[PDB]
Amino acid sequence: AELLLSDNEDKKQRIKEEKQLKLVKWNFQAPTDEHISQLQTLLGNQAKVSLMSQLFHKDFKQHLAALDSLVRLADTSPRSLLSNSDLLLKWCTLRFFETNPAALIKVLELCKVIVELIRDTETPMSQEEVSAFVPYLLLKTGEAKDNMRTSVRDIVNVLSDVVGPLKMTPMLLDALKSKNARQRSECLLVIEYYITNAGISPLKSLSVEKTVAPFVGDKDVNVRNAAINVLVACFKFEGDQMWKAAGRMADKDKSLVEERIKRTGV
Numbered sequence: 001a002e003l004l005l006s007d008n009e010d011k012k013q014r015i016k017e018e019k020q021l022k023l024v025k026w027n028f029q030a031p032t033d034e035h036i037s038q039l040q041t042l043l044g045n046q047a048k049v050s051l052m053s054q055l056f057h058k059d060f061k062q063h064l065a066a067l068d069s070l071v072r073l074a075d076t077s078p079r080s081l082l083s084n085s086d087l088l089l090k091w092c093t094l095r096f097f098e099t100n101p102a103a104l105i106k107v108l109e110l111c112k113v114i115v116e117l118i119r120d121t122e123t124p125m126s127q128e129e130v131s132a133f134v135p136y137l138l139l140k141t142g143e144a145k146d147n148m149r150t151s152v153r154d155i156v157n158v159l160s161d162v163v164g165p166l167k168m169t170p171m172l173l174d175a176l177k178s179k180n181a182r183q184r185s186e187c188l189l190v191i192e193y194y195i196t197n198a199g200i201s202p203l204k205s206l207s208v209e210k211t212v213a214p215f216v217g218d219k220d221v222n223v224r225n226a227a228i229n230v231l232v233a234c235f236k237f238e239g240d241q242m243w244k245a246a247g248r249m250a251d252k253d254k255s256l257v258e259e260r261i262k263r264t265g266v
Contacts, residue, residue, distance in 0.1 A: 188226035
């Protein structure tokens with residue numbers, strides 16, 4: 001009987017073709033016809049046309065049907081999801097640009113299943129696969145609903161295990177350039193968790209203290225509080241080196257951080 005979605009090793013061929021500059025890089029600001037057509041060609045070589053017709057419909061409806069079929073493969077053909085993880089995660093990023101909460105819930109459920117299978121099987125994720133997915137998933141950290149931010153962070157927590165703090169942090173730092181204050185604060189909270197659990201030393205080449213310090217002065221209280229807590233987490237590991245690494249801070253920003261240190265240690 002035929003699989004709805006292939007189980008082969010064509011992922012290696014896709015990664016190699018991208019490195020050979022024979023695939024366009026999934027690094028757009030917003031999806032373009034060129035990226036969608038490339039994905040549709042690559043997925044067309046892996047998926048039955050009835051899945052393909054749903055995947056590239058307009059009709060959010062028709063996406064839910066594809067998502068249901070794909071989520072069920074986790075039970076019946078999990079190697080299909082693994083073999084095609086890079087293409088499925090790219091299709092999910094296209095869904096990150098639409099506003100439709102019902103579809104989003106099911107997209108995130110698919111993303112969760114895929115990153116759990118990658119983690120559990122110890123499947124390596126290439127830099128290309130990571131970069132194609134994570135920067136767009138981080139957009140959804142700015143979702144207005146608290147349960148939606150939670151679902152996104154649960155996927156980030158699996159990827160942090162697969163990818164590791166050192167390779168995740170540059171994308172989390174880059175996310176701070178966002179206009180969306182929920183995205184900036186949620187991204188700081190992930191950095192805070194890395195430092196609390198593994199220390200600042202593994203992250204030393206990244207200039208975390210200095211990049212994060214200006215956000216103690218952010219307009220948004222959640223960003224300020226998380227930025228303060230990143231610097232306090234650093235302090236706990238490296239003491240006054242935190243201050244050297246951070247560089248010049250507004251005097252009043254520095255007092256807020258000093259008071260937080262004082263209070264968390266009484």
